[PDB]
Ligand binder design. Structure first.
Ligand SMILES: [Zn+2]
Ligand SMILES: [Zn+2]
Lengths: 118, 50, 88
RNA sequence: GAGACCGAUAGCGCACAAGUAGAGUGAUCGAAAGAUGAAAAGCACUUUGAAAAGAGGGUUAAAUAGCACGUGAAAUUGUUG
RNA sequence: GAAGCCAGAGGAAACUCUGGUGGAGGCUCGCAGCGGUUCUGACGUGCAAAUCGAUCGUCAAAUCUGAGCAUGGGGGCGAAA
RNA sequence: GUGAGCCCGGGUCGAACGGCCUCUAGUGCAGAUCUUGGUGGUAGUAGCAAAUACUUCAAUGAGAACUUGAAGGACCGAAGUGGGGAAAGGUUCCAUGUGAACAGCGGUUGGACAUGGGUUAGUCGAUCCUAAGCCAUAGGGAAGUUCCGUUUCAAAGGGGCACUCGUGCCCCGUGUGGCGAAAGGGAAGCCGGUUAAUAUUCCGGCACCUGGAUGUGGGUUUUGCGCGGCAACGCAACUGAACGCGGAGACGACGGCGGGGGCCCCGGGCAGAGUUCUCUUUUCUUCUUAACGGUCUAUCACCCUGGAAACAGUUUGUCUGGAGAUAGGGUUUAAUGGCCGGAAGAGCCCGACACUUCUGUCGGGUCCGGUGCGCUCUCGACGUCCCUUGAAAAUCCGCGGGAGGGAAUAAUUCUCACGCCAGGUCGUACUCAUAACCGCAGCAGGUCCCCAAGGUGAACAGCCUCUGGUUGAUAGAACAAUGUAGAUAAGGGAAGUCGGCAAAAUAGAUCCGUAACUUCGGGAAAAGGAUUGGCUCUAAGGGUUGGGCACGUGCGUGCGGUUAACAACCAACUUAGAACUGGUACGGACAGGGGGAAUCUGACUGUCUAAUUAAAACAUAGCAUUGCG
RNA sequence: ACGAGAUUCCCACUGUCCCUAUCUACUAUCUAGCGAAACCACAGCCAAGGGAACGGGCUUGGCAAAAUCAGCGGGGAAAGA
RNA sequence: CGAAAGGGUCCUGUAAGCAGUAGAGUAGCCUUGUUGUUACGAUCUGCUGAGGGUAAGCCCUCCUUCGCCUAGAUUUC
RNA sequence: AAACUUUCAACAACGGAUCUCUUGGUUCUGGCAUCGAUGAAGAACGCAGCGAAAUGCGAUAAGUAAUGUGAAUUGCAGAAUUCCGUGAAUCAUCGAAUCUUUGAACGCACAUUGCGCCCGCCGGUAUUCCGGCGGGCAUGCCUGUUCGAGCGUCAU
């Protein structure tokens, strides 16, 4: 049986856009099939980890699939992971509480200074 | 090559249409001096220079 | 190996076809014609080459409009039709 | 419109499908090459050959002019003496 | 067969010895490729205006290579001949 | 006629020319290695000798070594003499016909010559994007051709609102355009068939992408813009302007390890073929499954419980863990994995009839396993190196925000399913080379890539073979000298020669053993030794599955035991040991270091005089000096 | 340490010789077909003499017989001399 | 005379095939070993100085076979 | 004696000199002033019943109109011409036209038959989609128009 194959396009060089895989046809023939580059997993904007639940596709393939397949039902879903979202929530709450505390302390010091001046 | 521009293919088409011997009735005209195609081209002899 | 062996590596093109003059003298990397000087507005010519001037001077081509000018001058650049001529 | 000019190795590179054919990556370089006959009348027909052609036989004023074609020198060659 | 690592035996510890593991290097033998050392080599109006055979250097990199682009003669480029 | 010359005869030939006196000049050839053209001897001479090789019959034809068919014999031997491409060529492609010329012979043949025919795309490239780089604009130089400039010392423009003092007002800042890749980036097509020649382009079947319009079904909503899960997150939907954030595009080299496809290998079965003196339940061939989808699964990682020293988990490679390990239970990125649709109706194999052709018709089958330090491509998790850290843009998506728009006269501005419409331009033949490109040529040179079978063997070494290609390079006869290429030679063993030049000797692998010197890394395969065939055995080195009770009822507890140290089944290649046996040889061809003592010399790896010099030359790391805030 | 750098020696090894012999292929050779070039004042047997240190041709002698083939490398020719 | 063949003379080294209480050992079947037996198994032994080659520049052969023959062409005091 | 080599002659070859010819050069003289954004010179690609070139021409393509002449063209084919005529012709003249893609070359580009923008018209079910056709869109500068900007100078 003829086991050797050829390119099916006019590019003869083994570049990154010239990837092929070997198939066997229903006609019993060994042939190549030109395939695209592998899709890349989307990554978290804060830590860079791969986001669970999101498909890894070439960039224009995301326009063909529906919204719930491209995201996670959470704030910053499909853009940031759950640990980073939890860190954002805790940091935001604690920093605004500390701002309230600092404003109380500044008002107390200002009142003490005004009482000392008066 | 197989890849070619339209301009190059037009020049090749004109060369292909020019590549012929003269019609035989040319030699029978009154006062004819043309005996053969003095500008005949062959793909192994003279390059088109494109 | 500077002769016959080195001549086997000649498969590129310094020059292509020029749109203005038609010769194979358009430098593919400079985009400048060695013969006619395209894309400069003036046609390239020099007084040290009388032969090159006479190869491309007026009259070497078709003279599509210029060959009719002496007849129009001889008849005085007239307009109109002969008197009583057929027409509209 | 002309010449005490040149007459196809001369005269323009070019008397001719000459700035052509051809060469060079390119700028550029750049030839050779005219003449059957008054008229194609450019050889019917027969014959030998696979053919090219040959031989007869016409055509012509002449083929000692056969699209190798006016004339046809020399070098050099064949045959004959 | 470099660092790193495991085990065993010592040593107060640092370390020392033994057996493994690991896979470093402008390291090495060597195929392709790249190069071009030698031969009273072949060839010498050649297959070739530098070719052919055997042999040889290098072979994971200061390695080999295509296309696009840049540097133009008072110049360029040059591990410099 | 002294002579340069003049005149006549004969022959050939076909249209003009001469004497005398003056005038006029591009006016007289043996030479210039002249100039152009033509022609000899040499001479039927030198050759027409790399790439292993040809032979028989028949046909065609005037004619056959180099045409064709059959019959043989060989070669390329998968880094090909194979199957396709990039550059370059441009019709060389296919059919028919053919005088000369060309194919250094011959030619009936041809890439030659003559007449015709052949290249079919929304999905393959171009076209788009930007890279290194190049060119306009503003502006400034230059006598000027033009030079610089590409974000600048530029008024270099987008959006929204408005019934009024109606002929306005508001918001925003980022700059400036174009060219530049048929190997970078990038929306989307597969299989079967079909021609003399095109095919992921034609035909048939089955799909996909992009954009547009507008329906139906389904979804959401009277708690207006979904529900579920502790969570990771899921699900057919499930609003989202300005202005922002983020991801993808988007990325080095090398090392071993693991997963998957294809190839290679092994066993059985049906069908066909070959072998058959003897043997061989034999040797060989078909036994296939695309894009696109559905569904169930697949390392990393993440989540929940819980709290670890008698530290534990764990890779070939020592990393991980109170910043929460192990364990148990889950969630997810990732298919070239399994099953199903596609799809057996195809393709392939076999058989039985029919058949002047036109044309075919009908049956049977296409199945089940195994293996691996194999080859190749791809994916994943690791690791190493850097005074080296290994593109950009077009383009697509997610999120933050909450502007608008939204219901029971029902509404819907739903990334869900189905349905409707549309997709322009070229390029597409063929060669890619011992004859299609460059080298003046059909030149032993040169010229960028994939795909890559079996045996031997460490091995894309050498040698032999399969598929697929060739059998093409002037032939016949003879076997002198001298050659070129390949070999052998008794005895001696470098006496040869300027010089051991050349040749010979060595060589794989296992084992014993290995000096001086040394920058401690090397030297080192130093040196010097012992062995190797065939056959018949022996031993060692693995994988998978599988525990008794008591209750509820094939799962949950409460126990109990670590001799499963046992059984059943399956599997491959290495290593060691022993007997027997042939021998002139045992790495039996092939392949394959001679070694040692020293001296000079440049540190080393590297580089140059393409076409006489490859080196103590150049470079190099290291070192030193000078200048500059 | 490394080296296609230059040199001397040792062991092994042998057709380097001593001393040459033999075998194979391809040539050379013969035939069919095909078919150049370099070079060429004219030509090609010598000896002695030919003042200018040179004879192929002159003088005097030796002599001297068609047409040819394979070799050969003394002159004569032959080095992009 | 030629082509075969036969005999001789030389060269090599014992053919194919069959068989064997030869053969290190291994595995089966049973009499469980008493050539226990059968199967395989390099090699060994016998048939077998056998097979093969032998003039191409070896020898012999009226009396071992088959074939060929008094030409053709050219030239000559 | 032949053959061979050489010499002489005749005929035949080879080759293209000589002679004669010349729709060509060369030089002199005389006359004339007329290229282009109303797109030149030049380039490419095409056009004939049967053409490769030269010549002529431009999709109206070896040509159309008009004027004049007055019977061809011719290599073949096919047709002529009411010849007493709106009429042959590869005819002459030439005032009317056609004049592809380009080129100073002009929407932006061009190594691409690449990409646009504006305004009309027509066709295909068509308010939205698809297709065809027509006319336009370079730069510098002048004159004018109209819309503007700036406490630059003022008036109110
Ligand atoms: Zn994160
Ligand atoms: Zn030009």
């Amino acid at each position: 049986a003829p086991t050797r194959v050829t390119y099916r396009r006019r590019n003869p060089y083994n570049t990154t856009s010239n990837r092929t895989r070997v198939i066997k046809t229903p006609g019993g023939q060994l042939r190549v099939l030109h395939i695209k580059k592998r899709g890349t997993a989307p990554k978290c904007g804060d830590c860079g980890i791969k986001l669970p639940g999101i498909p890894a596709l070439r960039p224009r393939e995301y326009a063909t699939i529906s919204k719930p397949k491209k995201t996670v039902q959470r704030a910053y879903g499909g853009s940031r992971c759950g640990n980073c979202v939890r860190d954002r929530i805790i940091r935001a709450f604690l920093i605004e509480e500390q701002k309230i505390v600092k404003k109380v302390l500044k008002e107390q010091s200002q009142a003490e200074k005004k009482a000392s001046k008066k | 090559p197989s890849h070619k521009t339209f301009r190059i293919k037009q020049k090749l088409a004109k060369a292909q249409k020019q590549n012929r011997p003269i019609p035989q009735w040319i030699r029978l005209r009154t006062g004819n001096t043309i005996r053969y195609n003095a500008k005949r081209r062959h793909w192994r002899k003279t390059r088109l220079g494109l | 190996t500077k002769g016959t062996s080195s001549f086997g590596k000649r498969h590129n093109k310094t020059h292509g076809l020029c749109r203005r003059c038609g010769r194979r003298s358009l430098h593919n990397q400079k985009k400048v014609c060695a013969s006619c000087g395209y894309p400069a507005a003036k046609t390239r010519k020099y007084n040290w080459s009388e032969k090159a001037k006479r190869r491309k001077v007026t009259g070497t081509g078709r003279m599509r409009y210029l060959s009719t000018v002496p007849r129009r001058f001889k008849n005085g650049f007239r307009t109109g039709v002969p008197k009583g001529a057929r027409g509209p």
